[PDB]
Amino acid sequence: KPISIIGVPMDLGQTRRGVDMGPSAMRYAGVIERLERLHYDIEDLGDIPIGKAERLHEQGDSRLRNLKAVAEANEKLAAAVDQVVQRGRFPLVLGGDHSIAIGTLAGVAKHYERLGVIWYDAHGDVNTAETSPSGNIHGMPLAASLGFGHPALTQIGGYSPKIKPEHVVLIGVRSLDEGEKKFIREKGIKIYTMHEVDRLGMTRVMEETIAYLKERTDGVHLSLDLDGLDPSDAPGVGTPVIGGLTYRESHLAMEMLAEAQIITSAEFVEVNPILDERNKTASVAVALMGSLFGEKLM
Amino acid sequence: KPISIIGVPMDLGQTRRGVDMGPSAMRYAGVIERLERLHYDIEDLGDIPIGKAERLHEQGDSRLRNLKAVAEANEKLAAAVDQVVQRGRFPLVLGGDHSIAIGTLAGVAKHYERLGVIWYDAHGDVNTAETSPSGNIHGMPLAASLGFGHPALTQIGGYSPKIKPEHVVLIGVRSLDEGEKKFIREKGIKIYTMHEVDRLGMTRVMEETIAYLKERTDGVHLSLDLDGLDPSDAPGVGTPVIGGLTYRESHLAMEMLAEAQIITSAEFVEVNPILDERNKTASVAVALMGSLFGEKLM
Amino acid sequence: KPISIIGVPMDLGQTRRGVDMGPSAMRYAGVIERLERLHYDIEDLGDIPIGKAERLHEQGDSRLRNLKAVAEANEKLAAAVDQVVQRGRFPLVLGGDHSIAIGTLAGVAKHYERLGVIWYDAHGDVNTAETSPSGNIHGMPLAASLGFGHPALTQIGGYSPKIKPEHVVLIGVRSLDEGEKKFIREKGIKIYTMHEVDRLGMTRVMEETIAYLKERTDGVHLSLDLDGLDPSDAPGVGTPVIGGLTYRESHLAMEMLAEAQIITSAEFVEVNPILDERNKTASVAVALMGSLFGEKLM
Amino acid sequence: KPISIIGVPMDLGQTRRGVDMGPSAMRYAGVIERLERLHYDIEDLGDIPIGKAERLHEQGDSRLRNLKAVAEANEKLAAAVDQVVQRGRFPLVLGGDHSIAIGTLAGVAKHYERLGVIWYDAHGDVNTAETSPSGNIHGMPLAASLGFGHPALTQIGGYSPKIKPEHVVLIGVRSLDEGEKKFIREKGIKIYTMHEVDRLGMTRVMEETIAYLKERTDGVHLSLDLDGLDPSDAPGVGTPVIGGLTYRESHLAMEMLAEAQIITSAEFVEVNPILDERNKTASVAVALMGSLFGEKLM
Amino acid sequence: KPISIIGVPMDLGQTRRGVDMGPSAMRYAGVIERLERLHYDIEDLGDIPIGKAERLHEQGDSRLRNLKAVAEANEKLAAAVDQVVQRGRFPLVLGGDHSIAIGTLAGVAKHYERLGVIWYDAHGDVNTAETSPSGNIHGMPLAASLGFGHPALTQIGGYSPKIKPEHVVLIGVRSLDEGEKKFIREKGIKIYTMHEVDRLGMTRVMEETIAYLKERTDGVHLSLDLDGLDPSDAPGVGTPVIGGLTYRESHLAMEMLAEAQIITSAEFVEVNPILDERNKTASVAVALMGSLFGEKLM
Amino acid sequence: KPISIIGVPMDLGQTRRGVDMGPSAMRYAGVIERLERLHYDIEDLGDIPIGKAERLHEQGDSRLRNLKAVAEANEKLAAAVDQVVQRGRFPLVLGGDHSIAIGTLAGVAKHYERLGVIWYDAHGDVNTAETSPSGNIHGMPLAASLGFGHPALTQIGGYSPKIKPEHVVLIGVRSLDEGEKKFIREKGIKIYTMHEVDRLGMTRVMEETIAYLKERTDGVHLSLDLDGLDPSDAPGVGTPVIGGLTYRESHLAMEMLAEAQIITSAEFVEVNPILDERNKTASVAVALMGSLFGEKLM
Ligand SMILES: NC(=[NH2+])NCCC[C@H](N)C(=O)O
Ligand SMILES: NC(=[NH2+])NCCC[C@H](N)C(=O)O
Ligand SMILES: NC(=[NH2+])NCCC[C@H](N)C(=O)O
Ligand SMILES: NC(=[NH2+])NCCC[C@H](N)C(=O)O
Ligand SMILES: NC(=[NH2+])NCCC[C@H](N)C(=O)O
Ligand SMILES: NC(=[NH2+])NCCC[C@H](N)C(=O)O
Ligand SMILES: NC(=[NH2+])NCCC[C@H](N)C(=O)O
Ligand SMILES: NC(=[NH2+])NCCC[C@H](N)C(=O)O
Ligand SMILES: NC(=[NH2+])NCCC[C@H](N)C(=O)O
Ligand SMILES: NC(=[NH2+])NCCC[C@H](N)C(=O)O
Ligand SMILES: NC(=[NH2+])NCCC[C@H](N)C(=O)O
Ligand SMILES: NC(=[NH2+])NCCC[C@H](N)C(=O)O
Ligand SMILES: [Mn+2]
Ligand SMILES: [Mn+2]
Ligand SMILES: [Mn+2]
Ligand SMILES: [Mn+2]
Ligand SMILES: [Mn+2]
Ligand SMILES: [Mn+2]
């Protein structure tokens, strides 16, 4: 299926500047060339216009920092993504902090009976203004997409929820806030923390994830945060957490997903050139995209 | 069970200075705060007074360097540990070189009918003055505790042996002197070298270890030497050996032990701030203690 | 004098992508905050719109790569800069590759009888299509400003030359093409290569430079390329050359310039976040700007 | 079986200078002492004389760089190796780029009815002048030994082919040219790329490899290219590819081979001191040789 | 003159733990052997007992963190130092944060009519509770010794001030708070910031410093903070500031002081093993002490 | 004057293996191409055959390790060098440990009435079997050439001494054994240790050196040991000593020598690829040769 790339230069979901340079860092890491080689009809729809944040003290949210600008940028993204899907193309969203997942899922979910989600990440991203310890919206996209959070976030695209808890699989988690542990536990979300990855191995984790979703969804969205990889492999992220997934485990994951042919949309986020070492993180993302989209060693 | 921390600023078991700073390096890495967060009644009983070495020339044996100071400090440690156990508290000993294991086991073992031991280490520590290639007592604590070695060491606490060979499990070993291989083989001590870790995987090694001990001991003492981890993960040790256990394998091990609820005493040793990089090793030790004591990602 | 910042996201002057992210990397390194603290009336006029390059094979220049887009972007910059000067403000241009110096000098020079230039750089940037070994325009701005090169470049702003050879001082040079050595020699341009910096010392080099220009110009433009600093101090540049000026020599230079009060316009260029280590180079630039604009240790 | 070491200071199989220093870098890393310690009768037959290449423009094929010199040096190697085998000794060849495998296999194969080969490498080394993207002969030894390529290479030792496709096992591959993928696929060569190693685990890949070959060969030659290991473990190679085999996986592999007792000849190649960090790569090779030849941790 | 070493395991002058390990890190870096080699009668009087701080909320001033404990420990130090001077020995104090200078100067100054001070540091350490931006007493010792600050600090040893402004020389300064710049300016304290060191050169700064003090004091105390050196040379400090003095400049400084024979007491402070790389900073301090005490290359 | 390169793969003057790879490490760093570019008639006469060391036990002196092999290789070198000089060519010797200086000076000195020597090094190399703390001949070449030492070394080439003490200038020294300090002092050899370099500056040291020699010699031999540079700039040496000459000071020195036109022979020694980082040291040596032989930045 033809691919359409949409860059979302978003950093309002968190406080570290530079993550808005992620889309172009990845473009410069050769994302187009990489995919063209796989003989794909690849189109780059450019970047979503992101607005600026007003004085924190002058406006609305500390438990929900930059809510208006984040909700507006996400409305735009949701529309762009909805259109690509309508054109029968695969939407490949390049971030940008994880708050953009709200817009991506808003544009995709409407097109599926039961959209599944694989959240490849070191965190849960299931906080609400009530549970968030930072007020950073990039830590709330999954919860918001499940229909939990501020209506400005849960209603993007004009509907909610975008997905169901039983159709979500978290992989690589190693940092959850107490409220999130409760959320995950209570909503019954399938989660493979680093304990399970270490204990079962990435092959088994992926086999189970693929079988679980394939068995109950009609589409699967891959939401990959580079912080899911160990900081030694992906240093250019704002919220690094040691003891993460390796470069190889990640390529294996992408290769098994490609093999399964279940991924119908994807986004690579949190690439921050300014916290990186010579674009290493953007390069890992592009390599991972190569695997996801069909590259084979043999 | 409430925890009592006992620091043992010992460096007389070997020749590299600085390992006596281990206890405070770990305190500075936040060992108390870390454990308090797990809702533990944690108490820090301070440090065991360690004496200074006698004239190297007038000293008893080059095969048993600093024997008297080491045996004396170990008598004190054994008494302090014995008391904690008698008070119904879990003794958490922070070293200090591995020779302090002699004192820790002397204070604990008397309270169990069949105390088991998990020796997480890159070496065997089962040398005697006859087999030791260095004369360093930190390479003899396991043998001494099994009743093999100089009486000044084997009789600490007034009894011997502290444990039986069939109740010991070595994990992560990758450097054994010939006499130690003979000792292990002949005493029939269960051992998982890096070959078995690489071949079987940490999960299986831990499962087997836990089941083996759970099946025949009434208490288990964890004796963890930071040199058991790869020098890239724990550079601050006096006897580093490449090709070691990773950060994740070590957390998995601690998590599986926590889950099993078999650890009744523990000690983290050989942290040397002076051979380290910004307290990285003390930090790893504290993180490992967090997993051992119940932290869960989910 | 009030400062007006103009970002020029230019990378068409050379081939390494990412240098177009320099303006924002510096903004993120805190350029505004830094200058505001010096109690300056600082204004950020945003970025100059840069056009895209057409197929190399489809258009005009290999000895003059991206000539049209480079000349057009420079016309825009020249206008923006001209306006700031007319408003009686100091133009502070943030790049972007060095080809933007063509536009900056085009906007400034018209306002001075004898504008002097200090070219802080590892190279000479005095090539023409005839002498250029790469066809990269970022290696021709000085020559073009002196009136030597393609008319599309020498006539920006509608006049030429912008400056005279006798009013130019090169500092930190350690890589000159043969044609450039001839150019410098023949035009009689004052140059302090690393040999002179090593031999005389930065204090003497700066004293002489300041006295030389102060004695014959009515304004001095500082054109600072980060590659002038050693790659160990400023790794984020496309054309690094070892054995460069140190962090301290650079701050000394800026401090002596501030003291002299001869700098009437300035530009910091070649900052490339994508070839950098955690924004180190953008940070050095901002620190250097702090010194240039008056910061004092005492 | 006694061992005879043969150094082959070859760099003509590729373009990076320095790989000719590999034999001595390994000698300096202690290859002799390491093996003597295992109680081996070890003999160092010195180095095979390598000639200098003729003028490239006067050379016969650009798709076959340095063909004459490489074929010549290979004839000499084949003779020396043939002799060692005839003397009832194990030939241990130290390189030198991988093109020397042509000579090693030429001297060995003639002595076996069905010689098996384990190609521990990141590449396939199955190119021909037609498929080679570089013209570097170090990327053609496996194909040449299988009887595919220039006769100057396929006829070394006066016979062909040296081995059959069904007796070859590639391990650690992560970089194959299209022509090579077709070659491997069509010749039906057993291959375990990083996908399989990641998916199945080294233990299983080795068990299967050993069982497969043991079941159909009368001798097995190990041709180990240090680039098979991750560049972080073995940086001193001319063709590094990230996402490689770890230090531990490699020792496990060697240990399982030693255990199986199937290796009848071996060669360690591509060590380049000039692209290395303090002889790290030569040291790894020597340590792997120690495992291959019988070292045991327990 | 015989030397008496006094360790002061102090970290209460600031907030980073570990600087209390400085005295022993330097002992382990070989301070005694180094000095014995210079044929000195060296004596190690051990460490000054430091108390623990009282509850912050129950403390008297947040602008003066740990005031009681710091003042107490300083009284003890002053007494020990006073005693060494009375015995006709040179007091060599090892820290420990810079707040200990209050105690060192208190024990020394009383023995001189006009004690001079050389403050080798990146900061001024001339803050008061009013000007301090942190409330950390390690940033107030110079002012306190000059008689400016809380009486608990200014009256240590029972007298004040210990020294006069005209007898103080600051070298290597590159970080002064506004209040401190005003203080230095108004008290007329001689200061050589990095600008002067860069501009004049270390040789000239030292010649002038030595001549200035030699001309008006009857004793000179060297108070050397390792943060005065660049963080690349001395990473183990709590308040690092880039663009510092080099390893060579520091040895030159010590060598010129030794040559001048004006140093009558000294202290090396802020060494923090826990923020260091393999005891590098403690080693630098010891090497500098070797130069200060007479080592000569020729 | 045409240049003739003579490689001397010598490591018998010391104990660390690998320095014998120095000549080719430098050839691989492009020494020929570098000099050809300067329009030199450059000829590479290959390498001097070096013999293997005798049984350590049956060897002549532990105070003169490998004396016979070292003296023999030096006889050969002296002859090869003597010939080059007789052919009117400049002898450029590449080492190899510093003991080869004995042979280089033996072949050159006979052709001058008063040959001067510039010993660019971190050590003095003026030990004898009596003063040597190691027995390593690479620490005795200067003394031997001055006629002090074992006759097997002092009589190479059949005459002695090769040079006079008043015609020698040591630069960069920072490590002298006591006997060497006495030797230097008593023979009245001109020496600029790091103290003088730090105090006077490289420019002044070079000016003085050049004038001193120019005023009394008819030829000057440059004997440059890479250990003269700081280990951070030249890590690939067997006897590194911190606090050395920088990359720039070394280029300045070479440039001033080139300018003076006094160097009539030269040798670059102690490059050890095996203790280096990606051939960095050989690269520095080649760059230095480029400056020595006339390269100019301007
Ligand atoms: N997309 C991310 N990087 N999320 C990190 C979230 C961290 C933390 N749970 C928070 O809510 O602040
Ligand atoms: N299997 C693992 N890698 N576990 C990591 C656990 C780390 C630590 N105990 C935490 O809770 O953050
Ligand atoms: N606890 C330790 N670090 N032990 C290291 C022992 C090393 C060696 N086996 C010895 O006996 O000397
Ligand atoms: N499975 C492993 N990691 N084995 C490591 C063995 C290394 C080497 N053969 C030794 O005996 O030291
Ligand atoms: N602004 C620059 N970085 N210029 C580098 C120019 C390098 C070289 N002289 C060229 O013309 O290609
Ligand atoms: N004084 C200096 N740093 N000179 C550097 C010269 C480097 C080299 N000879 C060149 O021409 O590029
Ligand atoms: N032995 C090697 N390093 N081979 C690398 C081969 C790389 C590539 N397949 C080629 O044929 O050029
Ligand atoms: N299992 C793995 N590690 N696979 C790595 C594949 C990397 C990438 N897709 C390639 O073809 O180069
Ligand atoms: N001894 C020191 N490290 N002093 C640092 C002082 C920093 C700052 N001027 C303060 O008063 O907080
Ligand atoms: N000569 C120097 N190195 N000056 C450094 C000054 C740095 C900067 N202007 C500051 O005030 O922090
Ligand atoms: N060329 C050298 N690297 N010489 C080092 C000499 C070191 C010491 N002075 C010795 O005589 O052993
Ligand atoms: N000016 C210098 N850099 N001197 C370095 C001297 C270092 C030390 N005192 C020694 O004798 O080794
Ligand atoms: Mn996320
Ligand atoms: Mn141990
Ligand atoms: Mn430039
Ligand atoms: Mn290969
Ligand atoms: Mn201070
Ligand atoms: Mn030397």
mmCIF file of all heavy atoms in Angstrom, chain B residues 150-167:
data_model
loop_
_atom_site.group_PDB
_atom_site.id
_atom_site.type_symbol
_atom_site.label_atom_id
_atom_site.label_comp_id
_atom_site.label_asym_id
_atom_site.label_seq_id
_atom_site.Cartn_x
_atom_site.Cartn_y
_atom_site.Cartn_z
ATOM 1 N N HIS B 150 41.747 -20.994 57.017
ATOM 2 C CA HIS B 150 42.393 -20.714 58.279
ATOM 3 C C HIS B 150 41.339 -20.606 59.365
ATOM 4 O O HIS B 150 40.300 -19.985 59.161
ATOM 5 C CB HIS B 150 43.194 -19.432 58.171
ATOM 6 C CG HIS B 150 44.096 -19.200 59.332
ATOM 7 N ND1 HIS B 150 43.630 -18.813 60.570
ATOM 8 C CD2 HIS B 150 45.438 -19.309 59.451
ATOM 9 C CE1 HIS B 150 44.644 -18.692 61.404
ATOM 10 N NE2 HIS B 150 45.754 -18.986 60.750
ATOM 11 N N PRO B 151 41.573 -21.255 60.522
ATOM 12 C CA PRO B 151 40.663 -21.259 61.675
ATOM 13 C C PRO B 151 40.231 -19.887 62.145
ATOM 14 O O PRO B 151 39.126 -19.732 62.657
ATOM 15 C CB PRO B 151 41.460 -22.001 62.752
ATOM 16 C CG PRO B 151 42.865 -21.835 62.315
ATOM 17 C CD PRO B 151 42.769 -22.043 60.825
ATOM 18 N N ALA B 152 41.104 -18.896 61.990
ATOM 19 C CA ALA B 152 40.782 -17.523 62.383
ATOM 20 C C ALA B 152 39.608 -17.040 61.552
ATOM 21 O O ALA B 152 38.851 -16.173 61.981
ATOM 22 C CB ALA B 152 41.961 -16.615 62.169
ATOM 23 N N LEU B 153 39.456 -17.608 60.357
ATOM 24 C CA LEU B 153 38.352 -17.232 59.485
ATOM 25 C C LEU B 153 37.168 -18.201 59.583
ATOM 26 O O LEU B 153 36.015 -17.774 59.647
ATOM 27 C CB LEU B 153 38.828 -17.112 58.032
ATOM 28 C CG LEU B 153 39.967 -16.118 57.776
ATOM 29 C CD1 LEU B 153 40.416 -16.192 56.331
ATOM 30 C CD2 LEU B 153 39.516 -14.725 58.131
ATOM 31 N N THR B 154 37.458 -19.497 59.670
ATOM 32 C CA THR B 154 36.401 -20.503 59.724
ATOM 33 C C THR B 154 35.663 -20.552 61.030
ATOM 34 O O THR B 154 34.538 -21.030 61.083
ATOM 35 C CB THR B 154 36.939 -21.907 59.479
ATOM 36 O OG1 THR B 154 37.871 -22.230 60.516
ATOM 37 C CG2 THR B 154 37.614 -22.001 58.106
ATOM 38 N N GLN B 155 36.288 -20.050 62.085
ATOM 39 C CA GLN B 155 35.671 -20.090 63.402
ATOM 40 C C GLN B 155 34.999 -18.816 63.877
ATOM 41 O O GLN B 155 34.581 -18.743 65.032
ATOM 42 C CB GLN B 155 36.686 -20.555 64.445
ATOM 43 C CG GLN B 155 37.320 -21.891 64.126
ATOM 44 C CD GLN B 155 36.287 -22.967 63.831
ATOM 45 O OE1 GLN B 155 36.358 -23.639 62.793
ATOM 46 N NE2 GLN B 155 35.313 -23.135 64.740
ATOM 47 N N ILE B 156 34.903 -17.814 63.006
ATOM 48 C CA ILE B 156 34.255 -16.544 63.357
ATOM 49 C C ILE B 156 32.862 -16.832 63.911
ATOM 50 O O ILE B 156 32.099 -17.629 63.347
ATOM 51 C CB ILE B 156 34.104 -15.622 62.126
ATOM 52 C CG1 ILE B 156 35.482 -15.219 61.582
ATOM 53 C CG2 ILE B 156 33.281 -14.403 62.484
ATOM 54 C CD1 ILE B 156 36.183 -14.132 62.389
ATOM 55 N N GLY B 157 32.534 -16.187 65.022
ATOM 56 C CA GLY B 157 31.236 -16.413 65.633
ATOM 57 C C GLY B 157 31.229 -17.652 66.515
ATOM 58 O O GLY B 157 30.210 -17.980 67.115
ATOM 59 N N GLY B 158 32.347 -18.372 66.552
ATOM 60 C CA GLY B 158 32.440 -19.566 67.372
ATOM 61 C C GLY B 158 31.803 -20.865 66.912
ATOM 62 O O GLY B 158 31.467 -21.716 67.733
ATOM 63 N N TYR B 159 31.652 -21.047 65.610
ATOM 64 C CA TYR B 159 31.071 -22.282 65.101
ATOM 65 C C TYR B 159 31.408 -22.449 63.638
ATOM 66 O O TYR B 159 31.760 -21.487 62.966
ATOM 67 C CB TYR B 159 29.554 -22.275 65.276
ATOM 68 C CG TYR B 159 28.814 -21.259 64.407
ATOM 69 C CD1 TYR B 159 28.119 -21.661 63.263
ATOM 70 C CD2 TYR B 159 28.777 -19.894 64.754
ATOM 71 C CE1 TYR B 159 27.403 -20.747 62.494
ATOM 72 C CE2 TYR B 159 28.060 -18.969 63.987
ATOM 73 C CZ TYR B 159 27.373 -19.405 62.862
ATOM 74 O OH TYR B 159 26.632 -18.508 62.121
ATOM 75 N N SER B 160 31.288 -23.672 63.144
ATOM 76 C CA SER B 160 31.570 -23.960 61.747
ATOM 77 C C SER B 160 31.071 -25.347 61.378
ATOM 78 O O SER B 160 30.908 -26.205 62.248
ATOM 79 C CB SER B 160 33.074 -23.870 61.462
ATOM 80 O OG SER B 160 33.793 -24.909 62.094
ATOM 81 N N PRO B 161 30.695 -25.545 60.102
ATOM 82 C CA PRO B 161 30.733 -24.512 59.070
ATOM 83 C C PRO B 161 29.423 -23.740 59.149
ATOM 84 O O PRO B 161 28.483 -24.174 59.828
ATOM 85 C CB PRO B 161 30.800 -25.334 57.788
ATOM 86 C CG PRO B 161 29.887 -26.458 58.096
ATOM 87 C CD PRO B 161 30.334 -26.847 59.507
ATOM 88 N N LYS B 162 29.372 -22.592 58.481
ATOM 89 C CA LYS B 162 28.170 -21.787 58.478
ATOM 90 C C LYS B 162 27.117 -22.362 57.528
ATOM 91 O O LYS B 162 25.922 -22.299 57.822
ATOM 92 C CB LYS B 162 28.499 -20.339 58.122
ATOM 93 C CG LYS B 162 28.993 -19.497 59.302
ATOM 94 C CD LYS B 162 30.359 -19.952 59.790
ATOM 95 C CE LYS B 162 30.831 -19.076 60.925
ATOM 96 N NZ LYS B 162 32.199 -19.396 61.349
ATOM 97 N N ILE B 163 27.559 -22.935 56.402
ATOM 98 C CA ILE B 163 26.643 -23.526 55.421
ATOM 99 C C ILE B 163 27.247 -24.794 54.812
ATOM 100 O O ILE B 163 28.440 -25.060 54.997
ATOM 101 C CB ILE B 163 26.252 -22.522 54.248
ATOM 102 C CG1 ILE B 163 27.396 -22.343 53.236
ATOM 103 C CG2 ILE B 163 25.808 -21.143 54.806
ATOM 104 C CD1 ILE B 163 28.544 -21.479 53.714
ATOM 105 N N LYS B 164 26.407 -25.567 54.107
ATOM 106 C CA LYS B 164 26.791 -26.811 53.430
ATOM 107 C C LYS B 164 26.925 -26.550 51.930
ATOM 108 O O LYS B 164 26.136 -25.798 51.355
ATOM 109 C CB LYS B 164 25.695 -27.853 53.613
ATOM 110 C CG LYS B 164 25.401 -28.207 55.037
ATOM 111 C CD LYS B 164 25.273 -29.718 55.207
ATOM 112 C CE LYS B 164 24.631 -30.114 56.546
ATOM 113 N NZ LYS B 164 23.175 -29.730 56.638
ATOM 114 N N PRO B 165 27.850 -27.254 51.256
ATOM 115 C CA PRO B 165 28.106 -27.119 49.810
ATOM 116 C C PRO B 165 26.867 -27.316 48.949
ATOM 117 O O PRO B 165 26.710 -26.654 47.922
ATOM 118 C CB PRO B 165 29.097 -28.244 49.526
ATOM 119 C CG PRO B 165 29.782 -28.457 50.831
ATOM 120 C CD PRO B 165 28.669 -28.330 51.835
ATOM 121 N N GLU B 166 26.005 -28.244 49.368
ATOM 122 C CA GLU B 166 24.782 -28.575 48.639
ATOM 123 C C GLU B 166 23.703 -27.518 48.775
ATOM 124 O O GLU B 166 22.611 -27.670 48.220
ATOM 125 C CB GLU B 166 24.228 -29.915 49.110
ATOM 126 C CG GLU B 166 23.830 -29.935 50.557
ATOM 127 C CD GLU B 166 24.895 -30.501 51.474
ATOM 128 O OE1 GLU B 166 26.107 -30.300 51.232
ATOM 129 O OE2 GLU B 166 24.506 -31.163 52.461
ATOM 130 N N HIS B 167 24.006 -26.467 49.531
ATOM 131 C CA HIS B 167 23.083 -25.369 49.757
ATOM 132 C C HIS B 167 23.617 -24.060 49.166
ATOM 133 O O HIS B 167 23.129 -22.970 49.483
ATOM 134 C CB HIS B 167 22.835 -25.220 51.257
ATOM 135 C CG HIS B 167 22.165 -26.412 51.872
ATOM 136 N ND1 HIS B 167 22.313 -26.751 53.201
ATOM 137 C CD2 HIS B 167 21.334 -27.339 51.338
ATOM 138 C CE1 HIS B 167 21.597 -27.830 53.461
ATOM 139 N NE2 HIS B 167 20.994 -28.207 52.348
#
